[PDB]
Ligand binder design. Sequence first.
Ligand SMILES: Nc1ncnc2c1ncn2[C@@H]1O[C@H](COP(=O)(O)OP(=O)(O)OP(=O)(O)O)[C@@H](O)[C@H]1O
Ligand SMILES: Nc1ncnc2c1ncn2[C@@H]1O[C@H](COP(=O)(O)OP(=O)(O)OP(=O)(O)O)[C@@H](O)[C@H]1O
Ligand SMILES: [Mg+2]
Ligand SMILES: [Mg+2]
Lengths: 196, 194
Amino acid sequence: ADNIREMGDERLGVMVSGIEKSSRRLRNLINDLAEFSQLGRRSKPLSWVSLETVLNEVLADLQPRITEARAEIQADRLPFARCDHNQIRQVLQNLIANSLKYRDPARPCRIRIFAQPDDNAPAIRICVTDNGIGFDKKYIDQVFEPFQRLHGPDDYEGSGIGLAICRKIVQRHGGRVGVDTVPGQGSTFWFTLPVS
Amino acid sequence: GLLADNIREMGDERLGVMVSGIEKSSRRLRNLINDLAEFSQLGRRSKPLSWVSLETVLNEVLADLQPRITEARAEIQADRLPFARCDHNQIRQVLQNLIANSLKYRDPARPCRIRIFAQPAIRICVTDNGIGFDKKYIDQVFEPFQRLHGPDDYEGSGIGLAICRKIVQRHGGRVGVDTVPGQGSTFWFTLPVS
Ligand SMILES: Nc1ncnc2c1ncn2[C@@H]1O[C@H](COP(=O)(O)OP(=O)(O)OP(=O)(O)O)[C@@H](O)[C@H]1O
Ligand SMILES: Nc1ncnc2c1ncn2[C@@H]1O[C@H](COP(=O)(O)OP(=O)(O)OP(=O)(O)O)[C@@H](O)[C@H]1O
Ligand SMILES: [Mg+2]
Ligand SMILES: [Mg+2]
């Protein structure tokens, strides 16, 4: 006679739900891989487009997610740049979304999209700083690698491809990507765009 | 009190079914993912065309599948395949998909008898004493992810012949078939000489 079966039902519930969450993450990856890979197929040769209109697009899509976070986005005027507008909005997309996703629940999170002539063909470097949780400054090189997550899927579910994608789009443009982080303080990612 | 377990009896059968159904879906989905990635690596592995023995390719493809061939109690007439200027890996891939498809779609009433010949552009053929298909569906036959069969009685991924066509077309060839439902079908592909 089984007291055991009653315990099996507890364990079954765990596993069936494990397959269900483990299979949902697999669906997310399949989608993120299909959206981002089709961008390369739709690639157009670069022309000069206003980066401010592109940014205003990204603030349109995120208009639900921004209010959800009661976050304030201070948007400076972004110049023209010679780039692929569809692909560069995704770079703004993924970056503003990460600054929203990793908002810290104790302070109203504020995001800023700056523009400044960098130095390292003069390239304008666009930067997005946010007051978020940040990550450990040991991870600056690792962060841009795919599927290289810093924490388990318990606290944040993601695919690990978002920001590694940004790097390769910015690299098709002959730019670089980089980040400064202050754990607990906030993190700022930036990417450069070449001129000519 | 028995009603505690009178309940268990009726459900445990279903659970075994359902979980086993989910198990097949996980095999099928993994097969598809793998076959697509093998395909993406084949495009990467493209090497410029050279002269390869087409009979060597046949014997390799006949090597991997000889486990599946003994399973099938089928007879292979392995004719002499000449040289042709092509990619060895990709043409090995094309022989597999056709010979494997010709093994998979065999008739359970007849020992399927298979013929791999070549007849002059050089055209290579695989004739099979297997199932036929109906000429109303030839567009489906070559369409990717459109199989003519449900997954229960015949397993597969649906990309096999769409794969072959991109290979044979990268070689400047054709894909084509004559079919006789119930008797058998013979698929063929051509290669340029120059
Ligand atoms: N603003 C940020 N603050 C803190 N960590 C960040 C920030 N942006 C990115 N990260 C780190 O980047 C790691 C992976 O980034 P990435 O954006 O590529 O993936 P993701 O957010 O998990 O998922 P997805 O691909 O769906 O966007 C995250 O685990 C997080 O640690
Ligand atoms: N020798 C054959 N005899 C009859 N029908 C065939 C034969 N070879 C292929 N077909 C038909 O072609 C359809 C698609 O063939 P194809 O080989 O491309 O895919 P598949 O065998 O279903 O999958 P995969 O090769 O990805 O495992 C098959 O469903 C089958 O109906
Ligand atoms: Mg992201
Ligand atoms: Mg096949």
